[PDB]
Amino acid sequence: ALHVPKAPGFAQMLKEGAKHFSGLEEAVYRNIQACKELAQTTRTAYGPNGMNKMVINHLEKLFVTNDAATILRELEVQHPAAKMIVMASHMQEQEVGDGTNFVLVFAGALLELAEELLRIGLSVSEVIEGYEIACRKAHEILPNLVCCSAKNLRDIDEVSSLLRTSIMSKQYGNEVFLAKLIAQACVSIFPDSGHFNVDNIRVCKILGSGISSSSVLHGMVFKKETEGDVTSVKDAKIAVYSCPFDGMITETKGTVLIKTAEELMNFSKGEENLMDAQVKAIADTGANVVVTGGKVADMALHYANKYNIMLVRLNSKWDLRRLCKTVGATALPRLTPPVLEEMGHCDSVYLSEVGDTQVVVFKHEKEDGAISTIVLRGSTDNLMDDIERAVDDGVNTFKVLTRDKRLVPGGGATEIELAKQITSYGETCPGLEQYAIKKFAEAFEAIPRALAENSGVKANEVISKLYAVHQEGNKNVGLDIEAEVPAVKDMLEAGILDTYLGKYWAIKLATNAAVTVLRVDQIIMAKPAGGPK
Amino acid sequence: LAGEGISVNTGPKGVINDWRRFKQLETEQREEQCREMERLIKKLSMFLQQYRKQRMEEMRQQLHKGPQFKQVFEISSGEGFLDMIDKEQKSIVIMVHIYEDGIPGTEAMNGCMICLAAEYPAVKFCKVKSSVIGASSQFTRNALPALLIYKGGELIGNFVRVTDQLGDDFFAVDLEAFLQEFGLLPEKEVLVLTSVRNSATCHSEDSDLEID
Amino acid sequence: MMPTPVILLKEGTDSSQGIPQLVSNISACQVIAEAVRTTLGPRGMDKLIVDGRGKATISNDGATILKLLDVVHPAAKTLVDIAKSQDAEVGDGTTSVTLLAAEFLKQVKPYVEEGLHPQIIIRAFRTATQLAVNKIKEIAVTVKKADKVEQRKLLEKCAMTALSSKLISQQKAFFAKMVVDAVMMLDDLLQLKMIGIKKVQGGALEDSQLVAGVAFKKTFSYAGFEMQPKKYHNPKIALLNVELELKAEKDNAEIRVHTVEDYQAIVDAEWNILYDKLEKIHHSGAKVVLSKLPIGDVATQYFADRDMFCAGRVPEEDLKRTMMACGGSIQTSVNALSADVLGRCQVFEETQIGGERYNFFTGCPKAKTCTFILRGGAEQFMEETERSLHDAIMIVRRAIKNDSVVAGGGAIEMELSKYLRDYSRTIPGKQQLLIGAYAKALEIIPRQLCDNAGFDATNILNKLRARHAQGGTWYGVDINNEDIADNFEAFVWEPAMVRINALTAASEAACLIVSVDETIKNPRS
Amino acid sequence: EGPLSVFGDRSTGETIRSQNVMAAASIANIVKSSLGPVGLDKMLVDDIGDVTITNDGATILKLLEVEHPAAKVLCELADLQDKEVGDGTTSVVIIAAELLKNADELVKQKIHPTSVISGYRLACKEAVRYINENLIVNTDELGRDCLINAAKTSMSSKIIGINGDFFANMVVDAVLAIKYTDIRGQPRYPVNSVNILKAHGRSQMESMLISGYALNCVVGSQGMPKRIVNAKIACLDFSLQKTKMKLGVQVVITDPEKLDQIRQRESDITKERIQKILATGANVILTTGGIDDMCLKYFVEAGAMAVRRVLKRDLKRIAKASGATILSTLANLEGEETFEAAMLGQAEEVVQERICDDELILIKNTKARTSASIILRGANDFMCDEMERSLHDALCVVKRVLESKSVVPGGGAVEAALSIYLENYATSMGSREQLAIAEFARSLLVIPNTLAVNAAQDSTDLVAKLRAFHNEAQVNPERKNLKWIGLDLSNGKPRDNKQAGVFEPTIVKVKSLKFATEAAITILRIDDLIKLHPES
Ligand SMILES: Nc1ncnc2c1ncn2[C@@H]1O[C@H](COP(=O)(O)OP(=O)(O)O)[C@@H](O)[C@H]1O
Ligand SMILES: Nc1ncnc2c1ncn2[C@@H]1O[C@H](COP(=O)(O)OP(=O)(O)O)[C@@H](O)[C@H]1O
Ligand SMILES: Nc1ncnc2c1ncn2[C@@H]1O[C@H](COP(=O)(O)OP(=O)(O)O)[C@@H](O)[C@H]1O
Ligand SMILES: [Mg+2]
Ligand SMILES: [Mg+2]
Ligand SMILES: [Mg+2]
């Protein structure tokens, strides 16, 4: 009577390192606790008053940021339920670009309230049905909460005002300047055709002069140098070649079979003459810049230097394609001289040094082009990385605005209005699902609560004020960040607006993740074993 | 303390037998110490894509056919390992398995070697515990499952943590393909089922000779 | 903390959160700044750091010392990063950026301890830094004359101020003149690669020389090299990229013959190819032959027989400098060696320099390059001399870019602190405390100068504050006279952008450090 | 290893000075979260599962294991404050570490430590002088309410704080009971003569104040009565056992007939003594020594309570309270053995009271003197122990107020006033001392800062408003009522603490400054450390 044996049946047949969890307390409550812990970890980095987190991954690489998706991806989350919530957040990041923290906070709140509902007596099926009903109601209500629309995307001022809110949460101190930069970069891109490509905006990070010295260049910047002696062209005539700048060779195997003395003596002379003829034929088309994706032969380099031809070597094919897009050239596969339609043009190409790094600049005089680049300065690599993440968020916001032009008030106004309307609807609904609907409505309060907590005020007073103000009917009212006392203000005048599509997708994904986590009843984990990656 | 230029005369000469007595023992010990050192420490410090033929190779790998199915050679002495690797013809490959009883990832390996021995009679599959060899504490604790391979008296196989690239459910087909990827398994030969045996001995033939 | 059977993160994950984490970050920044504290000003010292292999390095340079430290603290690495950033953008003041950032953090540490919201501190830092940068731009002294003599004197004074903290400070005037003369020859881009720097053991510092041309070490002469004359009074230089050897015509060349006459013809053809290249080079009229690729012994003897000079395996940067000094081109083919592609220098000579042989190209009138030949008693001696010269060269290049100067010795910072205190006296009071703390932290550099020099810092700072309050912008620390003086009249000049970038980088680092509330350390793979 | 050739480590200059500040700051940071009404307790697991939940600074630092000599100085500083004052233990550690931390900054600024020490000594003397002249309130003009208010401040930040309305009256009535005057006619209050008994069970509000004395003892035999209507207490300091002859006496029998009578005397000696004690009418017999079984029977037959193994200190308190006399022996000055009725203490009742499955003696309404005891009821042993520690502080606070009849406003009112005054006064002493005295003035503000930060409020604004109010008091002669303005942690705004009844004994603040200054001076005096390697 000193040991409790394993129960006969499945308990004995289990493997050595395996783990089995079944029932409410062992599985569902524990999953809810894990998801709540994940939400707690990410909570403090929400809103303009969010705090950056120094995260160091297994490779001893330092990340400091407040982007929820980056923080989650830099943490090796082990619990499968939190893994699922992270997958939902990453899916939201991929689909929209902003709102990962909203997804995570909403999922955590929903799961916590689901745990409370299960404790007070409801069933999992009832809770899931209630959340699905409430999510459908919220998606119905959301279009009616739209306050204004973009109504113009070729303008600089309007696009800057629209993009300020997205990049105010990250880099709160200085958002106007970054908004102006990203607005200019996006307006240069996005031609009369309605299609907008996010990848057409490039970011170059050059260290040294503080982020306020960043600028926008209509073209591209490569952290390389020029192989040849020429380092400046004023009427660029780029002739892109995807082949190495050398005489082509046989693909199977080539051996120089010499049978007489004269052939041996004349081989090198003939080869050099052929190289010179090819390079002169290239130069006779007026081309003065040559960009090659392969190696550069010594004799080819010499003959190019003889004819005053700039040489730029691009190691990556993606850079070659981007340069072709931004210049207007075609990546030739042979050393044949380029024809006029394949002839690349640019306003200016030169070699310049920024800070202490030599760069090659392909600059367009016009405020237009296929590809635009943002030269980012700063005093730290991590700071420039954060500025790049903010730039990505702003560009994704611009893309979403291109897809859908509707906007809803931010700063917890939309969440409070949604909670109020869903609570009002839940009263009219009889049956047991009304509790789940009301908890779904209450879960929206975690957004204004997080904003108030991060801003340093009492969340309860802010929430009560928001409910009162929305009770009279001002549905565009959220908390005021620039105040040391709990206060609210109208977001429409303040211009604090977030994309409707982002809210829609974030709510959908958070609800789906919470419901899918709730559906799980048993967990059969296997021995972790190895898995180096 | 002076006269350090001793230039000793016969002391070491007079004790030459006693000196060789333990010098030979130390040489014998460092024989296996150097043989093992070549394994320890250095690696201890750290729809054709779906194998259509894997299944069918599994079924006709169940072709024991002959008498019983035998078992891998078990080595219970380090000197036994040393004087079996030192001896024997170096033309054919010698494969050694290191294991400790109880630890997972062993029985599957032994079954794979058992199945492969029938496929390749030339190979000399054998297994030995890490305890008798004299493996280090780290190698014993978390480096036991390893396929030591020797050919020509020198290492040809440098495999430890075979479960990392094989898991724990790997079959003989998986191990055979993995080894053939590196070109270490000797190529198969055509074989037929003899009645049982023909030959008895080889000596002066004295065959038939019709003479007047 | 109840133990979950299935924990959220991986085992061994370390997480420190809250006010203690930020206080630890500030303390770590202080610790890092202490390691470079005493290397400031004319009375600064040098630090010796030994790597694992035992190769010691001696430096007065803040960025070098910080890099040589194996800093792993995530908050402390920001100071090293901003030091490297200041070195890249400006090249001088790498100690000042770290000192200022750590002083900012130390000044705001008490307010953090009492629960002040970090966003307020960050906003105050941004406002103070913007105001200080605008003040520096406004009160920086510039001359609207572009006079050659005045500009040269300004550059020389800036270089002397930059150099007057290193072991070559005794010869600071000499080295500043050399640096200014070197920089003025660079044409438009002022590329560093166009200023050679060679180091040879033996000799006093005053034996260092600047060659108006190019010089490089002798490169593995073959047999028959000693029969080549070693002085030419108007040589024509044939800069080549050619291997002058008897070798296979091509890597994949195969010769198939079936007659002894053809065999002899092939041998004579190889010899004739080599002799054709050599004869073309000789008939080009050149007297000095330099090749990036090796030059064989046969070619060396051929050139000796013609009273010419050869040198193979010349490093590429040396050939580029020779091109810039003499004015030719690097011909990969000898088939067209026209007169225009041949470099020309007045005198070429090979001399003995401290136990080594160096080839000298002097007398170039159109040279756009130079080469520093540094003499010293030890390897680290020349290394530190090169670092100091690099600092001076960067300062002079940037001063060529723009001639805006502010007086050094902390005078500019005392003026900035006075201005910031004056501003902070006229704001509500939550920002006032933080801006006053910023102004107080701006006084670290004069105090550090006094501490390193061995004065009484408090009295000097009191005198400086009184002088700045009562009038007088450029009054800073006078190290020799144990007192204060007008550093503008004392020619303690530095470019204003140096202080601009120092303040900007220090403010950005302080804001980034303060903005962090949690640190998560995943277990190493 | 160097030319000095000493077997041990060595630290010199700013290296050791920073270590001492780091060590002192570490101790303060331990207890900074246990200060003020919004402070919280701590669990101290004792490596074997023993749990100690406490808020007292002395108790925390006594249990902690410390290694650094500088930290040991502050840990012993807390114990000294507890012994000599009884309250303010957490404040003195916080102030001393803050005094040392600010003094180190001046030393790093090349200010000589002697000047800093000279400045600190001057500031401490003037802070004490200023307190005794402008910040003290005489308890004569307040009455009985000040003692309750002074006590209620003590229970604040303790587990009995919210019920302090009921506990303050219970504490005050206990101290007034044990009061008696001595030579020169100076009343004194022997606090810790109020026996405190812990027993879990009912809520804290059912804690009892016994108008007498309580013993953690029971009657010797179950056959005795468990209640005496009119006790005649007899206190003995010897054992009522079988009489065994001393070591120097030997019993040798040569006539076998004499053996039986000698064995009779081994028990009849004790019986005669007990008969003498009972013949005088004694009902309750309290003894420090043991009692054998047969002797217990004599009290049983007489119907008298007999308690054995009574603590020596408990017996003294009962004898003083009941008027009895401790008798180490039954020997008069005539060489005989007798027990007179004059050596009998009297009480109106003695009860074997039962308290939560355990029983204890209640000696109710002692005559010729007044005595008090307190029984604390809690949810478990863990909370009962903390109630005793909290109650001990309250008894000490009331003792200081009754003896020294001056009080000062609480809630950082004194610290804020001193910071304004000292920094203004610091502008008249040389040049080096001015910085040291100003730092002393600023270092005092850690107390109001620590109270505010515990309540999660804007400590920067509250102290600024608190300092602003005090600044007006020191510059405007007709606005001197602002001296009493302190902190109100419930609402986060300045409040007139004299009206609010937040008081402290003047000795708590004054002794804190003297102890903190000298402790800070001792550490500041060091600039080198030699740590010899242990011989093991
Ligand atoms: N100036 C502002 N005032 C109030 N709320 C703001 C302001 N700027 C942004 N927000 C709010 O912050 C939220 C964005 O938080 P963020 O850190 O971007 O998380 P996510 O990346 O998941 O959107 C939005 O819901 C928006 O309402
Ligand atoms: N002769 C001088 N007199 C007074 N101050 C000087 C003098 N030379 C340099 N300084 C001061 O020393 C400070 C630090 O410069 P230095 O130590 O040379 O480079 P770094 O800042 O890179 O360490 C500068 O701010 C400058 O004002
Ligand atoms: N009701 C109250 N309102 C404001 N301040 C108070 C109140 N009660 C106590 N305080 C203050 O809180 C400080 C902390 O006291 P406490 O830490 O409980 O004593 P100790 O230092 O002996 O542990 C005291 O200096 C006191 O002035
Ligand atoms: Mg966002
Ligand atoms: Mg310098
Ligand atoms: Mg107290």
Shortest CA distance to C374 belongs to which of C185, C168, C76?
C168
Q: How many residues does chain B have?
A: 212
**Nearest of A7, A12, A52 to residue A454 by alpha carbon:** A52
From residue D440, alpha-carbon distances to C434, D78, D121, D427, D536 in Å are 22, 20, 10, 13, 43
Give me the torsion for CA of D182, D186, D191, D193, rounded to 10°.
Answer: 10
Closest among A431, A525, A390 to A67, alpha carbons compared? A390
Pairwise CB contact (< 8 Å): C75 & A54: yes
Alpha-carbon C18 to chain mean position: 40
What lies within 8 Å, CB to CB, of A35 at 6+ separation is A81, A82, A85, A107, A108, A111, A517
Nearest CA to ligand 1 atom 11: A411
Asked if C249 has any chain A CB less than 8 Å from its own CB, the reply is: yes
Residue with tokens 């920044």: C29
**β-bridge pairing A62-65 and D227-228:** unpaired
Q: List the catalytic residue out of D54, D59, D89, D506.
A: D89
Binding residue numbers of C for Mg(2+): 92
Q: Return the residue matching tokens 């009295």.
A: C459
Give me the helices (H) in C286-360, please: 297-305, 316-326
The answer to whether the beta carbons of residues C504 and C9 sit under 8 Å apart is no
| Dist. CA B51–CA D150, nearest whole Å | 87
Phi and psi at residue B106, to the nearest 5°: -110, -50
Question: H or E segment at C319?
Answer: helix C316-326
Q: Is C194 helix (H, G, I), strand (E, B) or coil?
A: helix
Task: Give the DSSP per-residue string, A115-172.
Answer: HHHHHHT--HHHHHHHHHHHHHHHHHHGGGG--EE---SS-HHHHHHHHHHHTTSSS-
**Atom number in ligand 2 closest to CA C162:** 18
Q: How many CB atoms lie within 10 A of CB D131?
A: 20
DSSP string across D183-231: GGG-EE--TT-SEEEE--SS-GGG-EEESEEEES---S-TTS-SEESSE
3-state helix, strand, coil in chain A (%, to 5): 50, 15, 35
Contacts for C156 with CB less than 8 Å, ≥ 6 apart: C173, C176, C177, C180
CB atoms within 10 A of CB C2: 4
Per-residue tokens: C224: 């028959």
Q: How many CA atoms does the CB half-sphere of B117 hold within 13 Å?
A: 21
In one letter, which amino acid is A342?
E
Sequence-separated (6 or more) residues with CB below 8 Å from residue B43: B143, B158, B160
Retrieve residue C315's tokens.
């490093």
Q: Tell me the nearest-neighbour CA distance from A270 into chain C, angstroms.
A: 12
Q: What is the Cα–Cα distance from D294 to D273, expressed in whole angstroms?
A: 13
In this structure, which amino acid lies at residue D105?
A: E
Q: Kindly state the DSSP code that residue A353 receives in the 8-state scheme.
A: E
* The C236-240 sheet, strands edge to edge: C309-311, C288-291, C236-240, C343-344
Listed residue (C287, C295, C290) closest to C315, CA to CA: C290
SS3 C203: coil
Q: Verify whether residue C95 is a known catalytic residue.
A: yes
Going by C-alpha positions, the residue among A411, A374, A378, A413 that lies closest to residue A395 is A374
* β partners of residue C9: A77
Pairing of strands D358-366, D345-355: antiparallel
Q: Please, are residues A71 and A45 in contact by the beta-carbon 8 Å criterion?
A: yes
Max CA separation in chain C (angstroms): 104
Residue of D nearest to C431 (CA): D460
Q: Which two structure tokens, joined as six digits, stand for D140?
A: 């004569």
- DSSP codes of every residue in C13-43: -EEEESHHHHHHHHHHHHHHHHTTTTS-STT
How many Cβ atoms sit within 10 Å of the Cβ of residue A94? 11
The type of residue at C177 is: K
Which ligand 1 atom is the nearest neighbour of the CA of A45?
A: 17
Q: Strand ranges (DSSP E) for B56-99? A: 73-75, 94-99
> Does A8 contact B at CB distance below 8 Å?
no
Q: Are the beta carbons of A320 and A269 closer than 8 angstroms?
A: no
D34 is in an annotated binding site: no
Query: CA nearest D124: which of D418, D461, D328?
Result: D418
Element spanning B148, H or E: strand B146-151
* 3-state SS track over D227-238: EECCEEEEEECC
D70 Ramachandran zone, left/alpha/beta (phi>0; psi -120 to 50):
alpha
Q: Which ligand is nearest to the CA of C44?
A: 2
Report the C-alpha gap between C302 and A16 in whole angstroms.
82
From the number of C-beta atoms within 10 Å of its C-beta (0-12, 13-18, 19+), residue D297 rates as middle
Tell me how close the Cα of B101 comes to any Cα of chain A, in angstroms: 15
CA A117/CA A434 separation, integer angstroms:
11
A74: Cα separation from own chain's centroid: 15
Cβ atoms within 10 Å, residue C306: 14
A292/A243 Cα distance (integer angstroms): 7
Whether the CB-CB separation of D124 and D513 falls below 8 Å is answered with yes
Instruction: Kindly state the tokens that stand for D380.
Output: 């478990």
Q: Say how far apart CA A254 and CA A268 lie, in whole Å.
A: 16
C219 catalytic? Reply is no
Rounded distance, CA D488 to CA D493, Å?
A: 6
| D317 in Cβ contact with D216 (< 8 Å) | no
Distance (Å, whole) CA C442 – CA C413: 6
A503 within 8 A of A138, measured Cβ to Cβ = no
**Distances from the Cα of B116 to the Cα of B121, B176, C323, angstroms:** 8, 7, 69
Out of D393, D450, D506, D517, pick the active-site residue: D393
Sheet holding C231-232, edge to edge: C214-217, C356-362, C347-353, C231-232
How far does residue D145's CA lie from ligand 2's centre (Å)? Answer: 67
Instruction: Output the CA angle C311-C316-C320, nearest 5 degrees.
Output: 95
Q: Give A 338-377 residues with CB within 8 A of chain C.
A: 351, 353, 355-357
Rounded distance between C-alpha atoms, residue C302 and residue C279, angstroms: 9
- Residues in a beta bridge with C86: none
Query: What technique was this entry resolved by?
Result: cryo-EM
Cα(A184)–Cα(D240) distance, integer angstroms: 104
Euclidean distance between CA atoms A408 and A402, whole angstroms:
16
Residue C345 sits at φ, ψ, to 5 deg, of -135, 155
Which residues is chain B interrupted after (C–N above 2.5 Å)?
46
Query: Is A331 within 8 Å of chain C by CB?
Result: no
Tokens of B183: 């070109």
Beta bridge partners of A296: A245
The DSSP letter of residue D515 is H
Instruction: List all residues whose CB is within 6 A of at least one atom of ligand 2.
Output: C 39-42, 44, 62, 92-96, 161, 164-165, 408-409, 445, 449, 477, 479, 492
Q: Which two tokens stand for residue C227?
A: 């029969």
Catalytic-residue membership of D56: yes
Give first-to-last CA distance, chain B, whole Å: 97
The two tokens of residue A529 are: 């074993």
Residue D333: C-alpha distances to residues C451, D272, D336, D337, D524 (Å): 83, 19, 8, 9, 63
Consecutive H or E run containing B33: helix B16-37
Instruction: Fill in the amino acid letter for A230.
Output: V
Strands (E), A453-496: 477-479, 488-490
Q: At what angle do helices C496-514 and C19-34 cross, to 10 degrees?
A: 150
Residue of A37, A259, A383 with shortest CB distance to C508: A383
Q: Which string of DSSP letters, residue by residue, matches D24-83?
A: HHHHHHHHGGG-STT---EE---SSS---EE--HHHHHHHS----HHHHHHHHHHHHHHH
Mutate to test the pocket of ligand 3, among D32, D90, D131, D156 (most ligand atoms within 8 A of CB): D156
Give the DSSP H/E element, type plus range, for residue D270: helix D259-279
E strands, B4-93, are: 73-75
Query: Is the C-beta atom of D153 inside 6 A of ligand 3?
Result: yes
The H-or-E segment that residue C381 falls in is helix C379-401
d(CA D407, CA D426): 26
Which one, of D446, D490, D443, D485, lies nearest residue D467 by Cα? D485
Q: How far is CA B165 from CA A533, C106, D58, in A?
A: 13, 53, 61
Report residue A23: phi and psi, to 5°.
Answer: 90, 180
* C-alpha span between D508 and D407 (Å, rounded): 9
Distance (Å, whole) CA C288 – CA C237: 5
- Does the beta carbon of A508 lie under 8 angstroms from any beta carbon of chain C? no
How many angstroms away from the CA of A327 is the closest CA of chain C?
Answer: 26
Query: Which residue's alpha carbon is at the smallest distance from atom 6 of ligand 3?
Result: D411
The pair of structure tokens assigned to A388 is: 């790049």
Q: Reduce the DSSP state of residue A374 to 3 states and report it.
A: strand
| Set C57, C64, C78, C94: catalytic member | C94
Whether D111 has its CB under 8 Å from any CB of chain C: the answer is: yes
D110 vs C116: CB contact, 8 Å cut-off? no
Ligand 3 atom 4: residue of nearest CA: D411
Beta bridge partners of residue D374, listed in sequence order: D196, D209
Contact status of A198 with chain C (Cβ, < 8 Å): no
Give the pair of three-digit tokens for residue B113.
């070697």
Separation CA A529–CA D74 (nearest Å): 51
Q: What is the dihedral of CA D429, D433, D437, D442, to 10 degrees?
A: 130
Q: Which listed residue (D41, D54, D56, D366) is catalytic?
A: D56
Question: Which residue has tokens 């034996």?
Answer: C207
**Residue C222's Cα: distance from chain center in Å?**
36
**Rounded distance between C-alpha atoms, residue A21 and residue A522, angstroms:** 6
Q: Report helix, strand or coil for A402.
A: helix
Which helix (H) or strand (E) is A238 found in, with range? strand A238-241
> Cβ neighbours of residue C38 under 8 Å, at least 6 residues apart?
C44, C45, C452
Q: Is B101 exposed, middle or buried (0-12, 13-18, 19+ CB in 10 A)?
A: exposed
Residue with tokens 């902690």: D64
Q: Answer yes or no: are the C-beta atoms of D372 and D318 closer than 8 Å.
A: no
Q: What is the CA radius of gyration of chain B?
A: 24
The H helix count followed by the E strand count for chain D is 17, 21
Q: Count of H helices and E strands in chain C?
A: 16, 20
Q: How far is CA B62 from the centre of its chain?
A: 24
| Rounded CA separation D228/D304 (Å) | 8
Tell me which residue of C524, C516, C523, C525 sits closest to C74, measured CA to CA. Answer: C516
- In angstroms, the CA A32 to CA A112 distance is 6
Residue the block writes with tokens 């003594």: D273
Are B and C touching by the rule of 3+ CB pairs within 8 Å? no
Pure H helices in D381-505: 381-403, 413-425, 432-443, 446-454, 459-475, 497-500
> Cα–Cα distance between A359 and A205 in angstroms, integer?
11
Decide if D89 is catalytic. yes
The residue among A289, A334, A288 whose CA lies nearest residue A314 is A289
Q: Rounded to the nearest 5°, which phi and psi values hold at C312?
A: -105, 165
Mark whether D and B touch (3+ CB pairs within 8 Å). no
Q: Determine what percent of chain B falls in helix, strand and coil, rounding each to the nearest 5.
A: 40, 10, 50
Provide CB contacts within 8 A for C391, sequence distance 6+.
C61, C91, C92, C162, C163, C166
